[PDB]
Amino acid sequence: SFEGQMAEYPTISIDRFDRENLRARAYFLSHCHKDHMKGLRAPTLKRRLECLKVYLYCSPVTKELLLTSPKYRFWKKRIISIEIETPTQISLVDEASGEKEEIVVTLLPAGHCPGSVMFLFQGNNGTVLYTGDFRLAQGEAARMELLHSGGRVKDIQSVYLDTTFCDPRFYQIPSREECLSGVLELVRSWITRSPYHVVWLNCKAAYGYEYLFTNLSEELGVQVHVNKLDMFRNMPEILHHLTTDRNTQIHACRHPKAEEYFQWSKLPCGITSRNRIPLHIISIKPSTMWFGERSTNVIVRTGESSYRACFSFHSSYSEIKDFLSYLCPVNAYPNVIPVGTTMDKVVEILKPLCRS
Ligand SMILES: [Zn+2]
Ligand SMILES: [Zn+2]
């Protein structure tokens, strides 16, 4: 994984808050996933804040979701939200020496989960882009204005990028539109059969499924059952598509025993029936599917009442190549070395997409 520090601007820490990141002169959070929040509520950091003034920068939506959780509220006076595509000047103060450094940061949508951004940094040590976690369609980098000067791609020294699926194995992954379309039609065909036909969307406990929930709710006029929606209380574009009311045909609720429940025709929220009549439940499990270069269906049946539906939080190998090729940075560094590859193989895929 990425240890928080870009070589070009090492006095700021991104998506990593422990060890050497404890001495950072400014903090950045790309998005509100635990993989990118290590040490963020470490007592040693709660104290290092109080002893003097360092800030955490992030998207307005990221600030809302972060400050919703009780454990992070100590950040409240120390978070500065930056609007999307708004170049902003930040002052970095060396505590020991009193030296001031000036950097500009620009937040670009990363298409990962709500509030997820890339950080574009400009200053004395070159231009660098930290992608965080990102899913962008092929051709999307050419349509980002603030990666351009006078219709020309900006001169970028280093791109630090989401290499979750950086291998030709994950050559092609269906778009979020194709994924949504597949889920929409499976759900539609099921819940229109009668009022006792309900869907359980088996989703991990992590932001990034809302796009699914909000679009199912618009097209079908049915709110999605969730354990908690208070994180979205000041976000009407999401909130109004969700409910804590169990009386709905679409559930994204969660329970430790959800699997044994489903076996007994019980939703995680513990209902088996409506007006004494047992419900008809299908499970749909969003899960990453991929296709090799020289090798179909986003919906896979797994049982009489169970389905896997293609869904990805990270770009395909093809989408990585497209993004990085277009930017043609001097350097490209992987934010992650997945379990099934190595630094040398990922560098071997990245180096040819760089300048020279
Ligand atoms: Zn993530
Ligand atoms: Zn439920």
Numbering used by the authors: 3 to 53, 55 to 298, 301 to 361
What does the original paper state about this entry?
Human Artemis, 692 residues in length, contains an N-terminal catalytic domain (∼370 residues) with nuclease activity and a C-terminal regulatory region for DNA-PKcs interaction. Artemis is able to process several different DNA substrate structures, such as blunt ends, hairpin ends, 5′ overhangs, 3′ overhangs, and symmetrical bubble DNA structures.
Crystal form 2 was obtained when a hairpin DNA was used. However, after the structures were solved, the DNA could not be built into the structures of either crystal form, which resulted in a higher Rwork/Rfree gap during refinement. The unsolved electron density in crystal form 2 was not in close proximity to the active site identified by the metal center. This indicated that the DNA was present in the solvent channel but bound promiscuously. Crystal form 2 contained two Artemis molecules in the asymmetric unit and, for both molecules, residues 3–361, except residues 54, 299, and 300, were refined in the final structures. The restructuring of this loop and the coordination of Cys-256 induced a ∼40° rotation of helix αF from its position in SNM1A and SNM1B. The same position of helix αF was also observed for the structures from crystal form 2.
